[PDB]
Design a protein around this ligand. Sequence first.
Ligand code: CPS
Ligand code: SAH
Ligand code: SF4
Ligand code: BR
Ligand code: BR
Ligand code: BR
Ligand code: BR
Ligand code: FE
Ligand code: H2S
Ligand code: H2S
Length: 347
Amino acid sequence: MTGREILEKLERREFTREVLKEALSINDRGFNEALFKLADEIRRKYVGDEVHIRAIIEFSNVCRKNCLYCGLRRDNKNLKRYRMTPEEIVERARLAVQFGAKTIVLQSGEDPYXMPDVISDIVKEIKKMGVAVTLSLGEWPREYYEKWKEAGADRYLLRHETANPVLHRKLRPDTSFENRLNCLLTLKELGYETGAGSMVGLPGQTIDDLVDDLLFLKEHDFDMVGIGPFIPHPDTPLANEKKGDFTLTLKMVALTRILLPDSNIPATTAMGTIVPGGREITLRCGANVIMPNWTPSPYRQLYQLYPGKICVFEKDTACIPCVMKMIELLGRKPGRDWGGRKRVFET
Ligand SMILES: C[C@H](CCC(=O)NCCC[N+](C)(C)CCCS(=O)(=O)[O-])[C@H]1CC[C@H]2[C@@H]3[C@H](O)C[C@@H]4C[C@H](O)CC[C@]4(C)[C@H]3C[C@H](O)[C@]12C
Ligand SMILES: Nc1ncnc2c1ncn2[C@@H]1O[C@H](CSCC[C@H](N)C(=O)O)[C@@H](O)[C@H]1O
Ligand code: SF4
Ligand SMILES: [Br-]
Ligand SMILES: [Br-]
Ligand SMILES: [Br-]
Ligand SMILES: [Br-]
Ligand SMILES: [Fe+3]
Ligand SMILES: [S]
Ligand SMILES: [S]
């Protein structure tokens, strides 16, 4: 089908595998731009003009896992490891709330030290501030997830990374797609708002793989979907592999919006890392969430999933004000509430 035909099918919501592969495979400028306009329009129609700010505190870069793409992988000995104390995390959280953050995201490598009781304590103290708490701590026992829910956690981000179980296993040798998926399913059952998502341009990943990621996201109707390009980190086995294409990743964001019109989709730090102004672009192509880095110095510079992360040289407190300005110059509006998913039931 031609680009015009694919758009009309997408507009009609005939989301066949073939329509999705063709969408990802056509490189025509005119087609891409129309696809971005569609997704921008569906975003506006379903989730409005509010850009939700999730203040992310990356509280530890310790990790027991060895994912091949990740600078925090345990085999990376060329990284200063840190752990924030629960007091520092709580007080850093409080500063974000004082700055107007309505969701706190606590993210870390898979660091056993905190698990589960110290996270429980931290979540309970943060929840007292009357904001949403989102956890992004990786794969843990059902029991841990349960304790964290009971402690007051609202949401959990656990990117599925890749729905190709063979590629998944090769890139994440400690675990599997089955395990990853089971965590997402457990999270959902426990009542978390859950986030999935994938990297784009992983070594060995094909367009068919990306289509499978879309159909997976659509299958499970995730509340949130984080998508970024793969960015090689020099202290990893994937150091000399090619970074993910910005445009292709932006197309995955657009199609995710089209497939899940009422989902919460961030313009991820990785998009802004590979293209100057990439998050702003992404916010105009389907995304409606931003997650300003609230990780304090001198730890911020040490949380290197991938290198070059923008926002590492600014003052600790700069990213909240910066994203507020961003939201305003994009002609958008800050989130007025916790910005949980607001389901519009359709056919
Ligand atoms: C933290 C300190 C000291 C006082 C304090 O501790 N303030 C708690 C505020 C609590 N809330 C954010 C929940 C207010 C919501 C009321 S509101 O009327 O905005 O809905 C106060 C003093 C002035 C405040 C900044 C300015 O104002 C400008 C700007 C407005 C944006 O908007 C949010 C970002 C920013 C940078 C503000 C951040 C923060 O806040 C500041 C630094
Ligand atoms: N090199 C890289 N390039 C782009 N994104 C990467 C990356 N390394 C890691 N990421 C992204 O960063 C996300 C958060 S990693 C931190 C959360 C937790 N350890 C977990 O694994 O889920 C990952 O899910 C991954 O998609
Ligand atoms: S992606 Fe998460 S689990 Fe994998 S090495 Fe990085 S921080 Fe650890
Ligand atoms: Br969130
Ligand atoms: Br465990
Ligand atoms: Br995300
Ligand atoms: Br990211
Ligand atoms: Fe910033
Ligand atoms: S930012
Ligand atoms: S920033």
